[PDB]
Structure formats: C-alpha cells, structure tokens
Amino acid sequence: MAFSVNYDSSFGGYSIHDYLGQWASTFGDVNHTNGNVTDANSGGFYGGSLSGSQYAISSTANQVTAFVAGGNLTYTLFNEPAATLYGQLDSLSFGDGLSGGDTSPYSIQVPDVSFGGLNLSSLQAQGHDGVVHQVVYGLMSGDTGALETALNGILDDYGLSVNSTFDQVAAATA
Numbered sequence: 001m002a003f004s005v006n007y008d009s010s011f012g013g014y015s016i017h018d019y020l021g022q023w024a025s026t027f028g029d030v031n032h033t034n035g036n037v038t039d040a041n042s043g044g045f046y047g048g049s050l051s052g053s054q055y056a057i058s059s060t061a062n063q064v065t066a067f068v069a070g071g072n073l074t075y076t077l078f079n080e081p082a083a084t085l086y087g088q089l090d091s092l093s094f095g096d097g098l099s100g101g102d103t104s105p106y107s108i109q110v111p112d113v114s115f116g117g118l119n120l121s122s123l124q125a126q127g128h129d130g131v132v133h134q135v136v137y138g139l140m141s142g143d144t145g146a147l148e149t150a151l152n153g154i155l156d157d158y159g160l161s162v163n164s165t166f167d168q169v170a171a172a173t174a
C-alpha cells in the first residue's frame, strides 16, 4: 500500500483536481482562526483528546460534507510549536455525513472518494509548516493546494497527476 484509490462510481471520469474542487466548494471554510474557534470548527481525534488514529471534521457551512485523515496523528494544542498537527498521515477519505469517532471509528455515510498509502511524515520540530500540518489545515480551510501538490508527488512516479481521472489512477495501481 504505497498508494491506492477507492471511489463512488459517479467520479470515475472526474479528475482528482475536479473532485477536490467540488468537495472544497461545498465544504467551505471552517474558519479556524483567532477570535472564531469553537466546539463546532475544531474536529476531533479517534483515540484521545489531542492525539489519535484519525482526525475528522465536518463543514460548518452545510453540516454534512467532511473528511477523515487516518494514520498516526498526534497534535500539540499549546505545546512547543503552538497549534501544529504533526505525525503520520496514511489516508484521506472525503464525502458526506460524519458519524462515530468516540468508541467507534469516524465513518462517512456517503463516501465519494478515498486515498490510501500516502506515506506523509512531519515531525513536531517542523512546525505549522511541516507537511501533514499544511495538508490537513489546508483542508480545514477549503484549500486543497497542499494536498494536490503532495498527490502530484505520489502520482508522478506513475506518470500521472491530479489532473488525471480516478479510473485512470485506478488502472495505474494494481
């Protein structure tokens, strides 16, 4: 599992960039900035108040659209590097309807699209500009830039990019 995709068949013909743009447009922007944080726009880990096996959040614009990152995600709320998600990211899953996350895993009710085998490490020395911090925080802000750049990294070894279809990426993994 040095990479894999799964997807609702409706997206076979979407480029990765096109699905992510659709996803970001309706997810919106959680607005995780100063003066504006809440219970509502923070997310949560599965397996701890602050560290865990997956981090997940729902859109505060439509209550529904969501993602879940999953690998080995420690955080540092007030710790040495102030407010910076570090660790290990293996998977991103996008879609509608986040449930669970307490004594069960975070699970998406209506999955769209899912990447596994990302192999992306940032250690807590690298702060609020590590890499998993930049991806995840990016996603929390409706900004897929950081995820699309990393994906092109993974995908260009297969002679593809995020501007190729899901069916196409599927073919190149087997």
Ligand code: HEM
Pocket: 032, 033, 034, 035, 036, 037, 038, 042, 043, 044, 049, 050, 055, 075, 077, 083, 084, 085, 128, 133, 136, 137
């Ligand atoms: C792992 C996912 C998380 C990421 C990537 C993240 C990242 C950030 C970033 C980049 C800021 C910068 C604020 C700014 O400059 O405007 C921030 C603020 C903040 N975050 Fe997080 N955070 C995460 C999880 C959490 C969690 C679980 C909490 C707990 C409720 C939390 C509480 C806060 C607080 C209290 C602030 C500053 C509030 C203020 O000064 O007004 N964060 N976060």
Ligand SMILES: [Zn+2]
Pocket: 008, 009, 010
């Ligand atoms: Zn469908």
Ligand SMILES: [Zn+2]
Pocket: 029, 031, 032, 141
């Ligand atoms: Zn914003």
Ligand SMILES: [Zn+2]
Pocket: 023, 095, 096, 112
């Ligand atoms: Zn959707």
Ligand SMILES: [Zn+2]
Pocket: 096
């Ligand atoms: Zn939808």
Ligand SMILES: [Zn+2]
Pocket: 095, 096, 110, 111, 112
């Ligand atoms: Zn959908």
Ligand SMILES: [Zn+2]
Pocket: 143, 145, 146
């Ligand atoms: Zn950007």
Ligand SMILES: [Zn+2]
Pocket: 152, 153, 154, 155, 156, 157
């Ligand atoms: Zn490469």
